[PDB]
Design an enzyme around this catalytic site. Structure first.
Site, short mmCIF file in Angstrom:
data_model
loop_
_atom_site.label_atom_id
_atom_site.label_comp_id
_atom_site.label_asym_id
_atom_site.label_seq_id
_atom_site.Cartn_x
_atom_site.Cartn_y
_atom_site.Cartn_z
N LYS A 1 0.86 -1.19 0.00
CA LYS A 1 0.00 0.00 0.00
C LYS A 1 0.89 1.24 0.00
O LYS A 1 1.78 1.35 0.84
CB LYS A 1 -0.98 0.04 1.14
N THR B 1 -3.37 -5.65 0.53
CA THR B 1 -2.86 -4.30 0.76
C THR B 1 -3.75 -3.51 1.68
O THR B 1 -3.27 -2.66 2.46
CB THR B 1 -2.58 -3.55 -0.57
N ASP B 2 -5.06 -3.79 1.69
CA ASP B 2 -5.96 -3.14 2.62
C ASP B 2 -5.58 -3.49 4.05
O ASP B 2 -5.69 -2.65 4.95
CB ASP B 2 -7.38 -3.55 2.34
N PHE C 1 32.05 30.02 -11.21
CA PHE C 1 32.22 28.86 -12.09
C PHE C 1 33.11 29.25 -13.25
O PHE C 1 32.68 29.83 -14.25
CB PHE C 1 30.85 28.29 -12.52
N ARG D 1 28.08 34.70 -9.45
CA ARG D 1 26.78 34.29 -9.95
C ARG D 1 25.88 33.97 -8.75
O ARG D 1 26.33 33.78 -7.62
CB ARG D 1 26.87 33.10 -10.91
N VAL E 1 29.12 23.51 -7.70
CA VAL E 1 28.19 22.73 -6.85
C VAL E 1 28.88 21.47 -6.34
O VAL E 1 28.74 21.11 -5.15
CB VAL E 1 26.92 22.42 -7.63
N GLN E 2 29.64 20.82 -7.23
CA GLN E 2 30.41 19.64 -6.87
C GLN E 2 31.23 19.84 -5.61
O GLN E 2 31.24 19.05 -4.66
CB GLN E 2 31.33 19.26 -8.03
N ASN F 1 21.02 22.69 -10.17
CA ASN F 1 21.47 24.08 -10.29
C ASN F 1 20.36 24.82 -11.01
O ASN F 1 20.20 24.63 -12.21
CB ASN F 1 22.80 24.16 -11.00
#
Ligand code: NA
Ligand code: NA
Ligand code: NA
Ligand code: NA
Lengths: 295, 295, 295, 295
Positions: D10, D57-58, D159, D176, D227-228, D254
């Site tokens: 579920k 699943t109920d 960058f 930036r 970012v790395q 980004n």
């Protein structure tokens, strides 16, 4: 600390391409959303601020457009293979390219019973997708899929004989609604490179068509014992019809439609054989999965 | 302070109904999302904690299901009229009922070229809607619409001759892509009550069909001078084909597809006559609206 | 046929602006989504392919950016007034400008207990909005709002004494959960033009703050007889605290949290005074609205 | 054909729980969305319509509510471990339980500077999540995460020094905007069972808090080379502060903010040092990923 895994690139790259036949006037359109993520000898971009190993994601974006300009974008298995091969061949230090493509529907319009040469309709958010993993020294691994195919049958679904214990309240039924959103994946034999992919190009559209056809016909015709049982039938038939597929995966929600007891109001009968009005449930939902392979 | 306006009720009421023909085995399904908001002598529920004037929203929900059980749910203009009439007639102090219905597509499947008796597909998120305002002493006001009809044409759209000043950068074009999501509304003559609505029942499905047909054919065939000009043609034709419509409204985004100049890369030519690969723009978008009536 | 109403422009124009204080190093950011739709003597663009009367939507977009560069973007009531005034003054044939602004939250981060000079967090999708209608010869009409303010109280909500008839199943309660998404609008006195708007600039942020404060405190402290009764208290207090507001509108869903009877399982008690675990309901939901003005 | 993998259960089970302190009047709320998928000796439900092996699943849904009633729901790592352990112990033929929990924020309101005993605000769609895989004979594998943490810094992102070739158009920059939606995952040492999980319970909230704190402070203070490079710093610090974590994963888009050259209009200067107004780009976006482990 050390980098154990790393991949990076450009996601959500929307791409349109048109083909124009100058003899007939017939135009054909393709629209996709592309993601390309690269792996390779890139850990120093993370650990030592060494951007020299980064093929900029902006350049990856440019490359997607350039590759679409210079090559067919259909079938998406081929386009993704061309695109991923480019990155691992162009850049010595890039060793894998992971290409995901979502293909959007633009179906040609029929106007006064005739196909129109340049007008199209989005007949549903159903998608055709590929995941193409191009790994240097290890070929090309392709998973093809259809998703967002939403269906309903109003009878010829059953669910009885399940386990019953102190956590169980669900009544057995011999006639219920079954509705789902089909996510079906077929995983191809590894291909050694681009030449082998090209050698099989017609099978990509044909296998997508088979998978779709089998899904729809089995859903419509199987008097379903369970979602489990019905989805297995679909997978077995797809594997029987394309030997270059190794496995078939289904992921199916059970989108419940509940009966509504109205007998408190003027003795209205709306359950069982008298059930006409139902409450579609947004959540929760069953979720049923399997991967079927060759015995 | 004083209450100047008030309405309340139940939104997002999902409803399914099935019709089963016991002679033929053919089943037909309908699915909608309903909102009902009431107005009347209810201000003291806001100002003095007087809940006696509140028909509970839970009861409004129950009433939607009960009304669907006892009446046809199609065409939605009729169902909404029945539903709204119930509230203003049942409750002396309720003087208006505002019913919004969104109809969801369940199109019968064709399996091996034959229509299946009980299996359906959602062929797109295009909706058919109604807004039905039932006002005591002032009849029934119906607005019908189609929405989420997403289309694209790859040529035969133009945009030149617009105002050019110091805020303008857009180049004139004689050949562009045009893509939109159609939201089209037709507003009916006021009906005096439920009997008059019933007297016109076949015109609701026929006018929806006309509006859809005209939209698609005009979009496909008009070599468009502007979105403005094309949408006006659609409206004029719908008004000419159903005298009980007083106005037609269109609201159309211009979902831009931008050319991509690739000439910086190996002299690749991808603009003007050579344009093949485009960048679909998610935002911003033009938004063009008009309401057309009888001269 | 004839055009009865027409407006057009650019929607979904995303805009960011930064302010940089060169003495302190402190930077401040603003982000919005803007829509501008124009009306005027533009009907021939619809009826006669006359694009000369069209200020291109692309130019409207450019103008939004240019106006943001040359003017403050805060408070949004002022920015929208400047922007709309520009179009009706610049273009003789444009007679109304309809400006909608959605302001997105960028709250300055506190790092080690100190406000950071240039780093921000989106602390929720709650929005601050304006609708500014600039109509030549008729001033400037501003509606300010907050939306997407999602709240829950776990007790001190009641609902009893509502109408009970043959459509009613809801039990009366003296202790329930109440959760909503607040959409609150305050409508300003008409302003004669830009000078009058400017004369009141500090009141825009102060009234937004009051509306937010009153909403939260009344929701938290009112032992609620109904959503109707609680929302009226909010409106009355906002009107008492800003005489330049003519009306206050609330639109509040009742996002239901249902008790779960578990007594079928080992006699577990989870209702009434013993209720601990609840099922949040995605749909349906009550929807309660009012507009409150001065008596 | 044969089943190679199968799991079912579920999804989208919404759960609320309240704690009420009867001495102080202070109430505390928790809200989650839960998915439980089971694996075991269930293949005959797919291959032979054998529903006897299906725990409905109920019933899985019921079990989620029952377990929430009988146990703490916080920290989610513990709740998920209790829940998954139940299924593999209760059912001999069920050998794995896969529990995903999304925790939704309900932060206590401060009203007139004081914490309110029973009123809460959703201060953002940021989530706290767990994936708890309980596998018979192989313990409990937990991945904890935060997601939907949306941030922006207006400077101190750079960058430059990336690879430049014939596919490159991006200009190098030394200043930036950087904005992202943080998805951060910390993967725990395998636990042998529920007793070992319980033995570490305080570390779950403490490690979530550390991960959040490190993310925010590193984002705000790192003059980012990429970012790395920034995300690696975050991971290294989290691993240094909790020895029971084996790996940390980040996935960061980004979300680009583009300069807008306005010099075509009255020589307006809006680039480089003069950049004030930017165009947020909805798509495409960079997507940067890494998994960091112990050297
Ligand atoms: Na390589
Ligand atoms: Na009445
Ligand atoms: Na004017
Ligand atoms: Na077991």
């Amino acid at each position: 600390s050390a980098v154990k895994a790393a991949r990076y690139g450009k996601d959500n790259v929307r791409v349109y391409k048109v083909h124009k036949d100058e003899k007939t006037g017939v135009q054909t359109v393709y629209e996709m959303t592309v993601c390309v993520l690269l792996e390779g000898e890139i850990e120093t971009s993370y650990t030592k601020a060494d951007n020299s190993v980064i093929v900029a994601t902006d350049s990856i974006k440019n490359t997607i457009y350039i590759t679409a300009k210079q090559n067919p974008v259909t079938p998406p298995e081929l386009f993704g293979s061309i695109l991923g091969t480019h990155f691992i061949e162009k850049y010595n230090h890039i060793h894998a390219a992971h290409v995901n493509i979502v293909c959007h529907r633009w179906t040609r319009m029929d106007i006064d019973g005739k196909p129109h040469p340049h007008s199209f309709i989005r007949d549903s958010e159903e998608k055709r997708n590929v995941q193409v993993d191009v790994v240097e020294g290890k070929g090309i691994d392709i998973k093809s899929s259809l998703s967002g195919l939403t269906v309903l049958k109003s009878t010829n679904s059953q669910f009885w004989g399940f386990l019953r214990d102190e956590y169980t309240t669900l009544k057995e039924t011999w006639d219920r609604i079954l509705s789902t959103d089909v996510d079906a994946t077929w995983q191809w034999k590894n291909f050694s490179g681009l030449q082998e992919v090209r050698s099989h190009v017609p099978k990509f559209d044909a296998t997508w068509a088979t998978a779709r056809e089998v899904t729809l016909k089995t859903f419509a015709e199987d008097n379903s014992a369970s979602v489990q049982a019905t989805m297995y039938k679909m997978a077995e038939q797809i594997l029987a019809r394309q030997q270059l597929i190794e496995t078939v995966e289904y992921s199916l929600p059970n989108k419940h439609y509940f009966e509504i007891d109205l007998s408190w109001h003027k003795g209205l009968q709306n359950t069982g054989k008298n059930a006409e009005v139902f409450a579609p449930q947004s959540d929760p939902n069953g979720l049923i999965k399997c991967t079927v392979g060759r015995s």
